[PDB]
Amino acid sequence: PLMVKVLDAVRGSPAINVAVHVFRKAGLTAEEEFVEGIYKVEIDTKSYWKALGISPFHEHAEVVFTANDSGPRRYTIAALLSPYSYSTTAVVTN
Amino acid sequence: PLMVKVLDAVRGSPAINVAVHVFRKAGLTAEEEFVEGIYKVEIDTKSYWKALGISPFHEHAEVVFTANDSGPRRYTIAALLSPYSYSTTAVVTN
Amino acid sequence: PLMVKVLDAVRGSPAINVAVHVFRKAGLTAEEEFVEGIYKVEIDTKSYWKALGISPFHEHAEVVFTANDSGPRRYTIAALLSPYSYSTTAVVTN
Amino acid sequence: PLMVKVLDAVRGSPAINVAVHVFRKAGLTAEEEFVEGIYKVEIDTKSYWKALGISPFHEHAEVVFTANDSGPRRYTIAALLSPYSYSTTAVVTN
Amino acid sequence: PLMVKVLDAVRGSPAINVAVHVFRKAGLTAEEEFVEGIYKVEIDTKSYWKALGISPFHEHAEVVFTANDSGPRRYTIAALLSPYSYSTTAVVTN
């Protein structure tokens, strides 16, 4: 008798992020029966070489790898994954 | 007898993000029976080389890889995945 | 007897994002029986080389790869995946 | 008789992030039956070489790897994964 | 008779981050039946070479590895994973 109760009684303007998972149980990359990224925030994510495959650059491979991150980049974020009730959130740039 | 109750009683203007998952159970990339990205925010995501395949650049491959991220890029975001009730959210640029 | 109740009683102008999943069970890329992107926001996503195939650039391949991200790009977003009741959301540029 | 109660009684505009997981049980990368990233925030994440595959650069491979992170990059974030009720959150740049 | 009660009575605008996990039980990288990153914040994470594979650079491999982190990068974050009720959070730059 599995019973789960979340936020049974709610009143008064609450700001909630709810993540309820119920589970019952009676080759470069292998992933199975998984749950990922219920609330995921990715900012300025970089990935260059991934899962190239079978025998990459196997023989006589002259490879020059150059990765440059030289950009003027501004990330101004207010209240990231932060619910807020009866609040004041402001971003002011002068 | 699996029973799940979420937000059974709601009153008063609540701001909610709900993610309820119920599960019962009675080759470069292999992924099976998975749940991903219920609430995912990807900002400025970069991916250059992925899952190239079988025998990439197998023999006598002269490859020059150059990745440059040199751009003026502004990301101003307010209340990202942040529900807000009876609040004030403002982005002001002068 | 699987029973799921979400937002059984609702009153008072709530702003909700609902993601309810119920499941019962009685080759460069292989993915099976999966659920993805219920609420996914992709901003400025870049992908250059993906799933090229069988034997890419197999023999005597002289390849020069140059990836440049040098653009003036402004992303001003207010209340991204953030429901808001009895609130004030404004983007003002002067 | 598994019973879980979270936020049974709620009143007065609370700002909550809820992560409830219920579980019952009666080859470069292998991952199985896992739950990841319920609330994950990734900022300026870099990954260059991952899961290259079988026999990368197996024989007579002259490879020069250069990774440069030389960019002017400002990350101003207020209230990251920090719900706030009856509060004042402001980002002011002059 | 497993019974778990969290936040049974809530009143007065509390700001909470809740992480409740209930569990019952009646080859470069192998990970199984794990829960990770319920509340994880990754800032300026770098990873260069990971999970290269079977026999990387197996024979006669002349490889020069150079990793440079020479960028002007400012990370100003207020209230990271710090819920705050009836508070004042401000980031002011002059």
Side-chain angles (χ1 to χ4, degrees), chain B residues 3-38:
Chain B
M3 149 156 189
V4 174
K5 265 194 171 183
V6 176
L7 291 169
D8 188 15
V10 162
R11 176 173 54 178
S13 325
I16 321 94
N17 296 2
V18 190
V20 178
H21 170 93
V22 177
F23 184 98
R24 195 182 191 94
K25 201 170 187 301
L28 278 65
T29 302
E31 304 178 5
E32 301 179 3
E33 29 183 336
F34 58 103
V35 177
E36 185 182 359
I38 303 303

PDB file of all heavy atoms in Angstrom, chain B residues 3-38:
ATOM      1  N   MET B   3      -1.175   4.970  -4.610  1.00  0.00           N
ATOM      2  CA  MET B   3      -1.998   6.172  -4.593  1.00  0.00           C
ATOM      3  C   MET B   3      -1.100   7.389  -4.433  1.00  0.00           C
ATOM      4  O   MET B   3      -0.257   7.426  -3.530  1.00  0.00           O
ATOM      5  CB  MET B   3      -3.033   6.112  -3.462  1.00  0.00           C
ATOM      6  CG  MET B   3      -3.415   7.460  -2.877  1.00  0.00           C
ATOM      7  SD  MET B   3      -5.039   7.427  -2.096  1.00  0.00           S
ATOM      8  CE  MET B   3      -5.290   9.169  -1.763  1.00  0.00           C
ATOM      9  N   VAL B   4      -1.278   8.375  -5.308  1.00  0.00           N
ATOM     10  CA  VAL B   4      -0.489   9.601  -5.296  1.00  0.00           C
ATOM     11  C   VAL B   4      -1.440  10.788  -5.332  1.00  0.00           C
ATOM     12  O   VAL B   4      -2.316  10.859  -6.202  1.00  0.00           O
ATOM     13  CB  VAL B   4       0.494   9.663  -6.482  1.00  0.00           C
ATOM     14  CG1 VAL B   4       1.188  11.015  -6.531  1.00  0.00           C
ATOM     15  CG2 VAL B   4       1.513   8.538  -6.385  1.00  0.00           C
ATOM     16  N   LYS B   5      -1.269  11.714  -4.391  1.00  0.00           N
ATOM     17  CA  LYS B   5      -2.061  12.937  -4.330  1.00  0.00           C
ATOM     18  C   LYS B   5      -1.121  14.132  -4.317  1.00  0.00           C
ATOM     19  O   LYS B   5      -0.275  14.251  -3.425  1.00  0.00           O
ATOM     20  CB  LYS B   5      -2.963  12.950  -3.094  1.00  0.00           C
ATOM     21  CG  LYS B   5      -4.378  12.462  -3.351  1.00  0.00           C
ATOM     22  CD  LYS B   5      -5.296  12.813  -2.193  1.00  0.00           C
ATOM     23  CE  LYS B   5      -6.749  12.521  -2.529  1.00  0.00           C
ATOM     24  NZ  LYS B   5      -7.665  12.920  -1.426  1.00  0.00           N
ATOM     25  N   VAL B   6      -1.269  15.013  -5.305  1.00  0.00           N
ATOM     26  CA  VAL B   6      -0.482  16.234  -5.408  1.00  0.00           C
ATOM     27  C   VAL B   6      -1.436  17.403  -5.599  1.00  0.00           C
ATOM     28  O   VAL B   6      -2.279  17.375  -6.503  1.00  0.00           O
ATOM     29  CB  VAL B   6       0.535  16.170  -6.565  1.00  0.00           C
ATOM     30  CG1 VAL B   6       1.268  17.495  -6.701  1.00  0.00           C
ATOM     31  CG2 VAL B   6       1.520  15.032  -6.347  1.00  0.00           C
ATOM     32  N   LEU B   7      -1.301  18.427  -4.753  1.00  0.00           N
ATOM     33  CA  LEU B   7      -2.137  19.627  -4.821  1.00  0.00           C
ATOM     34  C   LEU B   7      -3.623  19.272  -4.763  1.00  0.00           C
ATOM     35  O   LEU B   7      -4.425  19.704  -5.593  1.00  0.00           O
ATOM     36  CB  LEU B   7      -1.812  20.448  -6.072  1.00  0.00           C
ATOM     37  CG  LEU B   7      -0.434  21.112  -6.074  1.00  0.00           C
ATOM     38  CD1 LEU B   7      -0.095  21.673  -7.441  1.00  0.00           C
ATOM     39  CD2 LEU B   7      -0.404  22.215  -5.033  1.00  0.00           C
ATOM     40  N   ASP B   8      -3.985  18.470  -3.757  1.00  0.00           N
ATOM     41  CA  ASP B   8      -5.373  18.044  -3.607  1.00  0.00           C
ATOM     42  C   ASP B   8      -6.297  19.236  -3.382  1.00  0.00           C
ATOM     43  O   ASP B   8      -7.386  19.307  -3.962  1.00  0.00           O
ATOM     44  CB  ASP B   8      -5.484  17.045  -2.455  1.00  0.00           C
ATOM     45  CG  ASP B   8      -6.857  16.407  -2.358  1.00  0.00           C
ATOM     46  OD1 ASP B   8      -7.638  16.506  -3.326  1.00  0.00           O
ATOM     47  OD2 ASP B   8      -7.157  15.798  -1.309  1.00  0.00           O
ATOM     48  N   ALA B   9      -5.877  20.187  -2.549  1.00  0.00           N
ATOM     49  CA  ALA B   9      -6.640  21.400  -2.283  1.00  0.00           C
ATOM     50  C   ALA B   9      -5.786  22.604  -2.650  1.00  0.00           C
ATOM     51  O   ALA B   9      -4.668  22.751  -2.148  1.00  0.00           O
ATOM     52  CB  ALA B   9      -7.071  21.469  -0.816  1.00  0.00           C
ATOM     53  N   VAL B  10      -6.312  23.457  -3.528  1.00  0.00           N
ATOM     54  CA  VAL B  10      -5.607  24.642  -4.006  1.00  0.00           C
ATOM     55  C   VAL B  10      -6.558  25.829  -3.958  1.00  0.00           C
ATOM     56  O   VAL B  10      -7.682  25.749  -4.467  1.00  0.00           O
ATOM     57  CB  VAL B  10      -5.058  24.436  -5.431  1.00  0.00           C
ATOM     58  CG1 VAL B  10      -4.736  25.766  -6.082  1.00  0.00           C
ATOM     59  CG2 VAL B  10      -3.827  23.543  -5.398  1.00  0.00           C
ATOM     60  N   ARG B  11      -6.106  26.928  -3.354  1.00  0.00           N
ATOM     61  CA  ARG B  11      -6.901  28.146  -3.270  1.00  0.00           C
ATOM     62  C   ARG B  11      -5.976  29.328  -3.022  1.00  0.00           C
ATOM     63  O   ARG B  11      -4.971  29.198  -2.319  1.00  0.00           O
ATOM     64  CB  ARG B  11      -7.956  28.049  -2.159  1.00  0.00           C
ATOM     65  CG  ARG B  11      -8.760  29.322  -1.943  1.00  0.00           C
ATOM     66  CD  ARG B  11      -9.893  29.110  -0.954  1.00  0.00           C
ATOM     67  NE  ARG B  11      -9.424  28.562   0.315  1.00  0.00           N
ATOM     68  CZ  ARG B  11     -10.206  28.319   1.357  1.00  0.00           C
ATOM     69  NH1 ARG B  11     -11.503  28.578   1.325  1.00  0.00           N
ATOM     70  NH2 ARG B  11      -9.674  27.801   2.460  1.00  0.00           N
ATOM     71  N   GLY B  12      -6.313  30.471  -3.610  1.00  0.00           N
ATOM     72  CA  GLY B  12      -5.625  31.710  -3.336  1.00  0.00           C
ATOM     73  C   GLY B  12      -4.600  32.146  -4.358  1.00  0.00           C
ATOM     74  O   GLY B  12      -3.659  32.854  -3.991  1.00  0.00           O
ATOM     75  N   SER B  13      -4.761  31.763  -5.620  1.00  0.00           N
ATOM     76  CA  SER B  13      -3.843  32.133  -6.692  1.00  0.00           C
ATOM     77  C   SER B  13      -2.393  31.700  -6.438  1.00  0.00           C
ATOM     78  O   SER B  13      -1.494  32.543  -6.368  1.00  0.00           O
ATOM     79  CB  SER B  13      -3.912  33.633  -6.948  1.00  0.00           C
ATOM     80  OG  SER B  13      -5.232  34.111  -6.760  1.00  0.00           O
ATOM     81  N   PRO B  14      -2.132  30.397  -6.303  1.00  0.00           N
ATOM     82  CA  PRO B  14      -0.742  29.930  -6.282  1.00  0.00           C
ATOM     83  C   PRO B  14      -0.175  29.723  -7.679  1.00  0.00           C
ATOM     84  O   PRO B  14      -0.872  29.297  -8.603  1.00  0.00           O
ATOM     85  CB  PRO B  14      -0.835  28.604  -5.523  1.00  0.00           C
ATOM     86  CG  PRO B  14      -2.170  28.089  -5.862  1.00  0.00           C
ATOM     87  CD  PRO B  14      -3.073  29.284  -6.073  1.00  0.00           C
ATOM     88  N   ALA B  15       1.113  30.030  -7.827  1.00  0.00           N
ATOM     89  CA  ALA B  15       1.847  29.785  -9.065  1.00  0.00           C
ATOM     90  C   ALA B  15       2.746  28.569  -8.862  1.00  0.00           C
ATOM     91  O   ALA B  15       3.748  28.645  -8.145  1.00  0.00           O
ATOM     92  CB  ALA B  15       2.663  31.012  -9.465  1.00  0.00           C
ATOM     93  N   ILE B  16       2.401  27.454  -9.505  1.00  0.00           N
ATOM     94  CA  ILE B  16       3.080  26.183  -9.285  1.00  0.00           C
ATOM     95  C   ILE B  16       3.566  25.633 -10.618  1.00  0.00           C
ATOM     96  O   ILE B  16       2.895  25.780 -11.645  1.00  0.00           O
ATOM     97  CB  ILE B  16       2.170  25.145  -8.591  1.00  0.00           C
ATOM     98  CG1 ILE B  16       1.293  25.788  -7.517  1.00  0.00           C
ATOM     99  CG2 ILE B  16       3.002  24.028  -7.984  1.00  0.00           C
ATOM    100  CD1 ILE B  16      -0.070  26.194  -8.024  1.00  0.00           C
ATOM    101  N   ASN B  17       4.738  25.003 -10.596  1.00  0.00           N
ATOM    102  CA  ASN B  17       5.199  24.137 -11.674  1.00  0.00           C
ATOM    103  C   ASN B  17       5.202  22.708 -11.150  1.00  0.00           C
ATOM    104  O   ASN B  17       5.914  22.397 -10.190  1.00  0.00           O
ATOM    105  CB  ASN B  17       6.588  24.544 -12.166  1.00  0.00           C
ATOM    106  CG  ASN B  17       6.606  25.928 -12.777  1.00  0.00           C
ATOM    107  OD1 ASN B  17       5.589  26.621 -12.802  1.00  0.00           O
ATOM    108  ND2 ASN B  17       7.763  26.339 -13.283  1.00  0.00           N
ATOM    109  N   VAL B  18       4.411  21.844 -11.782  1.00  0.00           N
ATOM    110  CA  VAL B  18       4.155  20.496 -11.289  1.00  0.00           C
ATOM    111  C   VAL B  18       4.812  19.496 -12.226  1.00  0.00           C
ATOM    112  O   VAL B  18       4.637  19.569 -13.447  1.00  0.00           O
ATOM    113  CB  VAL B  18       2.645  20.221 -11.165  1.00  0.00           C
ATOM    114  CG1 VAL B  18       2.404  18.923 -10.416  1.00  0.00           C
ATOM    115  CG2 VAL B  18       1.958  21.375 -10.461  1.00  0.00           C
ATOM    116  N   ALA B  19       5.568  18.563 -11.649  1.00  0.00           N
ATOM    117  CA  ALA B  19       6.215  17.489 -12.403  1.00  0.00           C
ATOM    118  C   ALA B  19       6.010  16.199 -11.616  1.00  0.00           C
ATOM    119  O   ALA B  19       6.788  15.886 -10.710  1.00  0.00           O
ATOM    120  CB  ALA B  19       7.694  17.779 -12.626  1.00  0.00           C
ATOM    121  N   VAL B  20       4.964  15.453 -11.966  1.00  0.00           N
ATOM    122  CA  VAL B  20       4.611  14.213 -11.285  1.00  0.00           C
ATOM    123  C   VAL B  20       4.812  13.065 -12.263  1.00  0.00           C
ATOM    124  O   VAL B  20       4.223  13.058 -13.350  1.00  0.00           O
ATOM    125  CB  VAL B  20       3.167  14.238 -10.759  1.00  0.00           C
ATOM    126  CG1 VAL B  20       2.820  12.910 -10.106  1.00  0.00           C
ATOM    127  CG2 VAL B  20       2.985  15.381  -9.774  1.00  0.00           C
ATOM    128  N   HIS B  21       5.640  12.099 -11.875  1.00  0.00           N
ATOM    129  CA  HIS B  21       5.913  10.917 -12.679  1.00  0.00           C
ATOM    130  C   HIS B  21       5.590   9.679 -11.857  1.00  0.00           C
ATOM    131  O   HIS B  21       6.098   9.522 -10.742  1.00  0.00           O
ATOM    132  CB  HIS B  21       7.372  10.888 -13.140  1.00  0.00           C
ATOM    133  CG  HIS B  21       7.784   9.595 -13.772  1.00  0.00           C
ATOM    134  ND1 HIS B  21       7.716   9.377 -15.131  1.00  0.00           N
ATOM    135  CD2 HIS B  21       8.265   8.450 -13.232  1.00  0.00           C
ATOM    136  CE1 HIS B  21       8.141   8.155 -15.402  1.00  0.00           C
ATOM    137  NE2 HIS B  21       8.479   7.572 -14.266  1.00  0.00           N
ATOM    138  N   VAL B  22       4.751   8.806 -12.405  1.00  0.00           N
ATOM    139  CA  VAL B  22       4.362   7.559 -11.756  1.00  0.00           C
ATOM    140  C   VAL B  22       4.774   6.406 -12.659  1.00  0.00           C
ATOM    141  O   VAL B  22       4.387   6.362 -13.833  1.00  0.00           O
ATOM    142  CB  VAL B  22       2.852   7.516 -11.462  1.00  0.00           C
ATOM    143  CG1 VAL B  22       2.466   6.172 -10.862  1.00  0.00           C
ATOM    144  CG2 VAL B  22       2.463   8.651 -10.531  1.00  0.00           C
ATOM    145  N   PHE B  23       5.554   5.477 -12.111  1.00  0.00           N
ATOM    146  CA  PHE B  23       6.079   4.348 -12.865  1.00  0.00           C
ATOM    147  C   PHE B  23       5.774   3.061 -12.113  1.00  0.00           C
ATOM    148  O   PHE B  23       5.931   2.996 -10.889  1.00  0.00           O
ATOM    149  CB  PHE B  23       7.596   4.492 -13.085  1.00  0.00           C
ATOM    150  CG  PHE B  23       8.203   3.405 -13.935  1.00  0.00           C
ATOM    151  CD1 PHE B  23       8.424   3.612 -15.286  1.00  0.00           C
ATOM    152  CD2 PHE B  23       8.576   2.191 -13.380  1.00  0.00           C
ATOM    153  CE1 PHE B  23       8.992   2.625 -16.070  1.00  0.00           C
ATOM    154  CE2 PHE B  23       9.140   1.199 -14.161  1.00  0.00           C
ATOM    155  CZ  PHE B  23       9.347   1.417 -15.508  1.00  0.00           C
ATOM    156  N   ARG B  24       5.340   2.041 -12.848  1.00  0.00           N
ATOM    157  CA  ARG B  24       5.088   0.726 -12.277  1.00  0.00           C
ATOM    158  C   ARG B  24       5.582  -0.341 -13.241  1.00  0.00           C
ATOM    159  O   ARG B  24       5.358  -0.248 -14.451  1.00  0.00           O
ATOM    160  CB  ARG B  24       3.598   0.516 -11.974  1.00  0.00           C
ATOM    161  CG  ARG B  24       3.318  -0.668 -11.063  1.00  0.00           C
ATOM    162  CD  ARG B  24       1.826  -0.859 -10.839  1.00  0.00           C
ATOM    163  NE  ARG B  24       1.554  -1.814  -9.771  1.00  0.00           N
ATOM    164  CZ  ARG B  24       1.345  -1.482  -8.504  1.00  0.00           C
ATOM    165  NH1 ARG B  24       1.368  -0.220  -8.107  1.00  0.00           N
ATOM    166  NH2 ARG B  24       1.108  -2.440  -7.613  1.00  0.00           N
ATOM    167  N   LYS B  25       6.254  -1.353 -12.697  1.00  0.00           N
ATOM    168  CA  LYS B  25       6.798  -2.449 -13.497  1.00  0.00           C
ATOM    169  C   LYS B  25       6.529  -3.752 -12.759  1.00  0.00           C
ATOM    170  O   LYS B  25       7.138  -4.015 -11.717  1.00  0.00           O
ATOM    171  CB  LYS B  25       8.294  -2.261 -13.750  1.00  0.00           C
ATOM    172  CG  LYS B  25       8.824  -3.031 -14.948  1.00  0.00           C
ATOM    173  CD  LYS B  25      10.246  -2.610 -15.287  1.00  0.00           C
ATOM    174  CE  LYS B  25      10.720  -3.260 -16.576  1.00  0.00           C
ATOM    175  NZ  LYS B  25      10.675  -4.746 -16.497  1.00  0.00           N
ATOM    176  N   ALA B  26       5.625  -4.564 -13.295  1.00  0.00           N
ATOM    177  CA  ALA B  26       5.284  -5.842 -12.681  1.00  0.00           C
ATOM    178  C   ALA B  26       5.970  -6.994 -13.404  1.00  0.00           C
ATOM    179  O   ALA B  26       7.083  -6.849 -13.907  1.00  0.00           O
ATOM    180  CB  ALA B  26       3.776  -6.041 -12.674  1.00  0.00           C
ATOM    181  N   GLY B  27      27.150   0.946 -32.075  1.00  0.00           N
ATOM    182  CA  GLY B  27      26.386   1.343 -30.906  1.00  0.00           C
ATOM    183  C   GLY B  27      27.023   2.484 -30.134  1.00  0.00           C
ATOM    184  O   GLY B  27      27.391   2.327 -28.973  1.00  0.00           O
ATOM    185  N   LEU B  28      27.149   3.641 -30.787  1.00  0.00           N
ATOM    186  CA  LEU B  28      27.798   4.784 -30.154  1.00  0.00           C
ATOM    187  C   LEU B  28      27.007   5.280 -28.948  1.00  0.00           C
ATOM    188  O   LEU B  28      27.592   5.623 -27.914  1.00  0.00           O
ATOM    189  CB  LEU B  28      27.992   5.912 -31.167  1.00  0.00           C
ATOM    190  CG  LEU B  28      29.195   5.859 -32.114  1.00  0.00           C
ATOM    191  CD1 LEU B  28      29.112   4.683 -33.072  1.00  0.00           C
ATOM    192  CD2 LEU B  28      29.306   7.165 -32.883  1.00  0.00           C
ATOM    193  N   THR B  29      25.682   5.334 -29.061  1.00  0.00           N
ATOM    194  CA  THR B  29      24.832   5.804 -27.974  1.00  0.00           C
ATOM    195  C   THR B  29      23.579   4.947 -27.929  1.00  0.00           C
ATOM    196  O   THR B  29      22.849   4.859 -28.921  1.00  0.00           O
ATOM    197  CB  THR B  29      24.464   7.281 -28.151  1.00  0.00           C
ATOM    198  OG1 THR B  29      25.662   8.068 -28.212  1.00  0.00           O
ATOM    199  CG2 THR B  29      23.607   7.762 -26.988  1.00  0.00           C
ATOM    200  N   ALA B  30      23.331   4.320 -26.782  1.00  0.00           N
ATOM    201  CA  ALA B  30      22.146   3.499 -26.571  1.00  0.00           C
ATOM    202  C   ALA B  30      21.498   3.918 -25.261  1.00  0.00           C
ATOM    203  O   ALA B  30      22.101   3.770 -24.194  1.00  0.00           O
ATOM    204  CB  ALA B  30      22.497   2.010 -26.550  1.00  0.00           C
ATOM    205  N   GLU B  31      20.277   4.441 -25.346  1.00  0.00           N
ATOM    206  CA  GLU B  31      19.525   4.885 -24.181  1.00  0.00           C
ATOM    207  C   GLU B  31      18.112   4.329 -24.277  1.00  0.00           C
ATOM    208  O   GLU B  31      17.496   4.382 -25.345  1.00  0.00           O
ATOM    209  CB  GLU B  31      19.493   6.415 -24.087  1.00  0.00           C
ATOM    210  CG  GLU B  31      20.862   7.077 -24.063  1.00  0.00           C
ATOM    211  CD  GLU B  31      20.774   8.590 -24.018  1.00  0.00           C
ATOM    212  OE1 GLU B  31      19.650   9.118 -23.904  1.00  0.00           O
ATOM    213  OE2 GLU B  31      21.831   9.251 -24.098  1.00  0.00           O
ATOM    214  N   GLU B  32      17.603   3.790 -23.169  1.00  0.00           N
ATOM    215  CA  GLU B  32      16.311   3.116 -23.179  1.00  0.00           C
ATOM    216  C   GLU B  32      15.487   3.515 -21.966  1.00  0.00           C
ATOM    217  O   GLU B  32      16.029   3.845 -20.906  1.00  0.00           O
ATOM    218  CB  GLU B  32      16.471   1.587 -23.204  1.00  0.00           C
ATOM    219  CG  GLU B  32      17.242   1.054 -24.401  1.00  0.00           C
ATOM    220  CD  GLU B  32      17.385  -0.456 -24.373  1.00  0.00           C
ATOM    221  OE1 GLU B  32      16.837  -1.089 -23.448  1.00  0.00           O
ATOM    222  OE2 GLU B  32      18.048  -1.009 -25.277  1.00  0.00           O
ATOM    223  N   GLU B  33      14.165   3.456 -22.142  1.00  0.00           N
ATOM    224  CA  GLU B  33      13.148   3.668 -21.102  1.00  0.00           C
ATOM    225  C   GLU B  33      13.543   4.773 -20.123  1.00  0.00           C
ATOM    226  O   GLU B  33      13.639   4.569 -18.914  1.00  0.00           O
ATOM    227  CB  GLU B  33      12.822   2.372 -20.352  1.00  0.00           C
ATOM    228  CG  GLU B  33      13.940   1.342 -20.244  1.00  0.00           C
ATOM    229  CD  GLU B  33      13.499   0.075 -19.539  1.00  0.00           C
ATOM    230  OE1 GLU B  33      12.534   0.137 -18.748  1.00  0.00           O
ATOM    231  OE2 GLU B  33      14.117  -0.984 -19.776  1.00  0.00           O
ATOM    232  N   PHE B  34      13.755   5.970 -20.665  1.00  0.00           N
ATOM    233  CA  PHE B  34      14.195   7.096 -19.858  1.00  0.00           C
ATOM    234  C   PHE B  34      13.273   8.292 -20.049  1.00  0.00           C
ATOM    235  O   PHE B  34      12.618   8.440 -21.082  1.00  0.00           O
ATOM    236  CB  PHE B  34      15.639   7.505 -20.183  1.00  0.00           C
ATOM    237  CG  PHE B  34      15.869   7.882 -21.620  1.00  0.00           C
ATOM    238  CD1 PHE B  34      15.968   9.213 -21.991  1.00  0.00           C
ATOM    239  CD2 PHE B  34      16.006   6.908 -22.597  1.00  0.00           C
ATOM    240  CE1 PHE B  34      16.187   9.568 -23.308  1.00  0.00           C
ATOM    241  CE2 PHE B  34      16.227   7.258 -23.917  1.00  0.00           C
ATOM    242  CZ  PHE B  34      16.320   8.589 -24.273  1.00  0.00           C
ATOM    243  N   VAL B  35      13.227   9.140 -19.024  1.00  0.00           N
ATOM    244  CA  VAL B  35      12.456  10.377 -19.042  1.00  0.00           C
ATOM    245  C   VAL B  35      13.422  11.522 -18.780  1.00  0.00           C
ATOM    246  O   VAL B  35      14.131  11.521 -17.766  1.00  0.00           O
ATOM    247  CB  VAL B  35      11.324  10.358 -18.002  1.00  0.00           C
ATOM    248  CG1 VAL B  35      10.585  11.680 -18.003  1.00  0.00           C
ATOM    249  CG2 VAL B  35      10.371   9.205 -18.273  1.00  0.00           C
ATOM    250  N   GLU B  36      13.451  12.497 -19.687  1.00  0.00           N
ATOM    251  CA  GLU B  36      14.423  13.577 -19.618  1.00  0.00           C
ATOM    252  C   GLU B  36      13.754  14.899 -19.965  1.00  0.00           C
ATOM    253  O   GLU B  36      12.797  14.944 -20.741  1.00  0.00           O
ATOM    254  CB  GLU B  36      15.607  13.315 -20.566  1.00  0.00           C
ATOM    255  CG  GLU B  36      16.738  14.333 -20.477  1.00  0.00           C
ATOM    256  CD  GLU B  36      17.860  14.051 -21.458  1.00  0.00           C
ATOM    257  OE1 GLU B  36      17.768  13.046 -22.194  1.00  0.00           O
ATOM    258  OE2 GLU B  36      18.833  14.833 -21.492  1.00  0.00           O
ATOM    259  N   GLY B  37      14.268  15.975 -19.374  1.00  0.00           N
ATOM    260  CA  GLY B  37      13.856  17.319 -19.728  1.00  0.00           C
ATOM    261  C   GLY B  37      12.415  17.676 -19.429  1.00  0.00           C
ATOM    262  O   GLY B  37      11.725  18.236 -20.286  1.00  0.00           O
ATOM    263  N   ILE B  38      11.942  17.348 -18.225  1.00  0.00           N
ATOM    264  CA  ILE B  38      10.608  17.783 -17.816  1.00  0.00           C
ATOM    265  C   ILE B  38      10.549  19.304 -17.748  1.00  0.00           C
ATOM    266  O   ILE B  38       9.603  19.930 -18.237  1.00  0.00           O
ATOM    267  CB  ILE B  38      10.218  17.141 -16.474  1.00  0.00           C
ATOM    268  CG1 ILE B  38      10.295  15.619 -16.573  1.00  0.00           C
ATOM    269  CG2 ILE B  38       8.814  17.558 -16.077  1.00  0.00           C
ATOM    270  CD1 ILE B  38       9.428  15.042 -17.658  1.00  0.00           C
TER     271      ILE B  38
END
